[PDB]
């Protein structure tokens, strides 16, 4: 490849669902995604959105094109559907885990295809909505996706954690355990 | 339960900055790249049969061909020298280096950007390479990386870190 890789357009659209995503990537990281509903450029790092700009109209236009093309390619292929994959999750901390020192648990899920997934956290087996953030789907060279979920937490001798991934490629949600 | 996915991407490959650029666009239907522009060829090509209706058609229309070609400058070159040089290429985040004991010393190097880094163990002033095990680069997904470097041994042991965000190396003694 290269010293660097700019991906200056990623348009992903799916049917049914009418699910669109438009991102920019640089060296594997997400610069921004275009909030298609709000027509807004949403930067992964706030500072960046004040150092540079992107007109979200670009994203909307891109998705519109790909939406149309998907129609055409669906017919052109005799409506061949996507083949579901089984994703793979690994859990790890952002930092070395020190009791009573706040940290972030990361769930990385790879081999995501199609890009529809539930990634949610269990804290000793109850759903943990609070302090949870997720990334966009990042592109893989084999045209599957990866996605990360983050849980902020206070480490503790007394707490067990799971990353649970629900995907069509899996019959029932699957738990990835960390302690 | 039939599901369909389409992907379009414009990929810019840069070597020694913009001294060498390769521009590739890709049209993908359900993981099948079926048409591609590649600046190394200078025109669209069917990658598979699904792309046979498009590539030559697009090649016959001079404005399609001139516009796609020029994206090497108007997208790749423009982005790299403009926004990207003030954002991604200027970002420097210094690693945090902590040593702990697993038996083994573990040197955790966290929260740095960019990826280019050298972590070295030292026992009493000498660079050890034997019995040293580094992870791969771990991508946190948030414009930071981490690397954990194990020393199978424990003397004064020093974890030594080199990174573009640093005027001189971090040395952490144990």
């Amino acid at each position: 490849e290269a010293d660097h890789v700019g991906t200056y357009g990623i348009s992903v659209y799916q049917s049914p669902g009418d699910i669109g995503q438009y991102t920019f990537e640089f060296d594997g990281d997400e610069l921004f995604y275009v909030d298609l509903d709000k027509k807004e450029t949403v930067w992964m790092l706030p500072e960046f959105g004040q150092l540079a700009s992107f007109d979200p109209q670009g994203g909307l236009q891109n998705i519109a094109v790909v939406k149309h093309n998907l129609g055409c390619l669906t017919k052109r292929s005799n409506s061949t559907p996507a083949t579901n994959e089984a994703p793979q999750a690994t859990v790890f901390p952002k930092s070395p885990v020190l009791l009573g020192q706040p940290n972030t648990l990361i769930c990385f899920v790879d081999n995501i295809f199609p890009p529809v997934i539930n990634i949610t956290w269990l804290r000793n087996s109850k759903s943990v909505a609070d302090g949870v953030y997720e990334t966009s789907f990042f592109v893989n060279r084999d045209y599957s996706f990866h996605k990360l979920s983050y849980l902020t937490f206070i480490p503790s001798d007394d707490d067990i954690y799971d990353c649970k991934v629900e995907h069509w490629g899996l019959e029932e949600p699957v738990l990835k355990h960390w302690e | 339960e039939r599901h369909f996915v389409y992907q379009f991407m414009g990929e810019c490959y840069f070597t020694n900055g913009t001294q060498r650029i390769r521009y590739v666009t890709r049209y993908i239907y359900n993981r099948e790249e079926y048409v591609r522009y590649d600046s190394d060829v200078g025109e669209h090509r069917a990658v598979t049969e699904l792309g046979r209706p498009d590539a030559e058609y697009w090649n016959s229309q001079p404005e399609i061909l001139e516009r796609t070609r020029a994206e090497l400058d108007t997208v790749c070159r423009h982005n790299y020298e403009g926004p990207e040089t003030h954002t991604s290429l200027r970002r420097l985040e210094q690693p945090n280096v902590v040593i702990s004991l697993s038996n083994t010393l573990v040197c955790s190097v966290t929260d740095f950007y960019p990826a280019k880094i050298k972590v070295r163990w030292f026992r009493n002033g000498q660079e050890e390479t034997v019995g040293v095990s580094s992870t791969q680069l771990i991508r946190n997904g948030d414009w930071t990386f981490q690397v954990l470097v194990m020393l199978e041994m424990t003397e004064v042991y020093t974890c030594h870190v080199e990174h573009p965000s640093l005027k001189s190396p971090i040395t952490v003694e144990w």
Binding site: G9, F54, N69 | N79, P83, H86
Partner: peptide
């Protein structure tokens, strides 16, 4: 500075 993007060709079917 402004990020600019590739534009996909639209297919007629």
């Amino acid at each position: 500075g402004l990020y600019l993007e590739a534009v996909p060709l639209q297919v007629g079917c």
